[PDB]
Amino acid sequence: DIQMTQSPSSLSASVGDRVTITCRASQDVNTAVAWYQQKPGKAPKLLIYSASFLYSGVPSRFSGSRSGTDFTLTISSLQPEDFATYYCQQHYTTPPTFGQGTKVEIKRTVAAPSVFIFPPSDEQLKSGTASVVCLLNNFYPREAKVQWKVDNALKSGNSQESVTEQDSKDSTYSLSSTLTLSKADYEKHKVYACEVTHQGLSSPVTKSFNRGE
Amino acid sequence: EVQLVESGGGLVQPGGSLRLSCAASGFNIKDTYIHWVRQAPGKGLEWVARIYPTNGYTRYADSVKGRFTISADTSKNTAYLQMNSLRAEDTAVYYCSRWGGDGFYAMDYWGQGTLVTVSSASTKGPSVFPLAPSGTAALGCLVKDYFPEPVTVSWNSGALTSGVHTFPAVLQSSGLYSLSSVVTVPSSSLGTQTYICNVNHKPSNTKVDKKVEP
Numbered sequence: 001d002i003q004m005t006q007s008p009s010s011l012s013a014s015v016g017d018r019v020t021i022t023c024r025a026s027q028d029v030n031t032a033v034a035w036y037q038q039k040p041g042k043a044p045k046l047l048i049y050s051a052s053f054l055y056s057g058v059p060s061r062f063s064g065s066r067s068g069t070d071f072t073l074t075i076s077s078l079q080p081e082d083f084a085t086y087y088c089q090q091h092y093t094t095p096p097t098f099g100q101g102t103k104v105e106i107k108r109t110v111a112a113p114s115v116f117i118f119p120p121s122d123e124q125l126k127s128g129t130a131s132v133v134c135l136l137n138n139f140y141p142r143e144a145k146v147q148w149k150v151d152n153a154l155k156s157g158n159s160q161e162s163v164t165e166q167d168s169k170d171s172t173y174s175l176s177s178t179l180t181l182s183k184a185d186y187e188k189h190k191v192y193a194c195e196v197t198h199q200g201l202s203s204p205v206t207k208s209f210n211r212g213e
Numbered sequence: 214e215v216q217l218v219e220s221g222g223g224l225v226q227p228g229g230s231l232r233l234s235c236a237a238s239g240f241n242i243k244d245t246y247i248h249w250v251r252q253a254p255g256k257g258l259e260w261v262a263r264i265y266p267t268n269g270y271t272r273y274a275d276s277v278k279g280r281f282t283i284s285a286d287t288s289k290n291t292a293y294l295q296m297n298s299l300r301a302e303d304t305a306v307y308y309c310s311r312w313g314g315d316g317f318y319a320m321d322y323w324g325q326g327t328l329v330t331v332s333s334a335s336t337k338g339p340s341v342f343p344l345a346p347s348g349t350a351a352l353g354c355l356v357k358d359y360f361p362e363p364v365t366v367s368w369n370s371g372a373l374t375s376g377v378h379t380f381p382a383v384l385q386s387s388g389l390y391s392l393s394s395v396v397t398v399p400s401s402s403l404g405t406q407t408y409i410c411n412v413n414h415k416p417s418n419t420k421v422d423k424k425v426e427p
């Protein structure tokens with residue numbers, strides 16, 4: 001099949017920035033190339049058809065061009081509502097094939113996370129499990145280090161992280177880290193803490209509680 | 214007035230069968246090619262199959278040849294995807310799309326998609342636990358141990374939307390999902406203003422309203 005090699009895999013650009021996304025076909029596909037935009041939880045939407053034609057209702061800041069087997073999507077002035085994954089597609093032959101996609105995030109200034117820690121509810125303890133939650137709220141960039149310490153001892157392999165999609169209003173991220181222990185193990189320790197390292201913080205921030213206190 | 218609406222998705226056992234439907238409105242499918250395109254969780258887009266409803270001519274991706282059958286009924290303006298010998302690999306959101314202008318406009322209209330989950334795990338409703346507070350305070354709900362996706366969470370029945378963060382679900386080692394939903398509020402309102410998270414897990418017919426108190 002004809003392969004569509006799309007680059008970059010991801011990119012961050014500030015609002016107003018001119019953005020360039022590339023897609024190289026493994027062989028001649030003429031102008032039978034399309035560009036799609038996909039926002040989290042939504043269907044793809046057509047932006048460009050026949051290599052260079054702007055689709056109905058799409059903002060004029062989107063454009064497409066072709067040079068041999070290379071196809072270029074350009075966003076002249078990146079807006080906050082352009083946060084999405086972009087896909088090229090050839091349909092010169094069957095099967096139609098897609099590029100791997102390019103995830104576009106909005107670049108903004110550094111923002112330090114607000115950190116919160118939540119002990120397990122008495123309700124959950126009754127069932128025999130203890131979940132401890134650490135929240136990092138509204139920060140940038142996305143890169144952050146969250147480390148669990150129980151009785152000042154580094155705990156590994158017992159926590160999972162989740163990160164929200166970039167916020168449409170302030171372009172920040174939020175993150176949850178959840179530590180799961182049995183009720184038995186939880187009752188064997190006193191100090192529960194999450195230590196957070198982030199570019200927006202001069203030094204690592206620790207939030208903790210003492211079980212039972 | 215052009216739209217495509219998929220239906221038929223859900224949770225199904227490996228090795229089983231499932232039929233999806235794609236109802237078209239605002240145009241006649243006899244005029245165009247109809248496609249199925251799928252997207253596995255956290256992955257890119259994969260074309261599945263195509264049909265020309267007028268003569269019933271079909272094409273398939275190698276990954277589904279023999280196992281899947283695409284078909285169409287022009288008198289119902291509807292296309293179908295019959296899925297057989299389902300595998301975990303087939304788990305995905307399935308989209309219906311059309312070729313506009315005999316292909317010139319590419320895939321110009323897509324449906325909203327229908328989620329197909331192929332798994333031997335049973336449905337399970339979530340437990341909902343409070344994340345008690347201790348924009349200066351944070352609180353939330355832990356929505357734990359459910360299967361399959363998706364769940365929905367609102368706060369105060371939609372009255373509270375600002376500062377809410379409902380995190381993507383993560384699969385636990387147990388093979389059950391878990392997520393938290395949090396919101397930041399004024400500390401001033403912690404002892405009086407009521408905060409309730411509304412959790413709906415339609416797959417298990419589970420509905421939970423949990424009040425979060427300090």
Ligand SMILES: *C(=O)OCc1ccccc1N=[N+]=[N-]
Nearest residue numbers: 150151152153154155185189
């Ligand atoms: C979790 O608390 O791991 C640490 C651990 C494991 C087993 C026994 C004791 C401890 N103490 N600590 N920390």
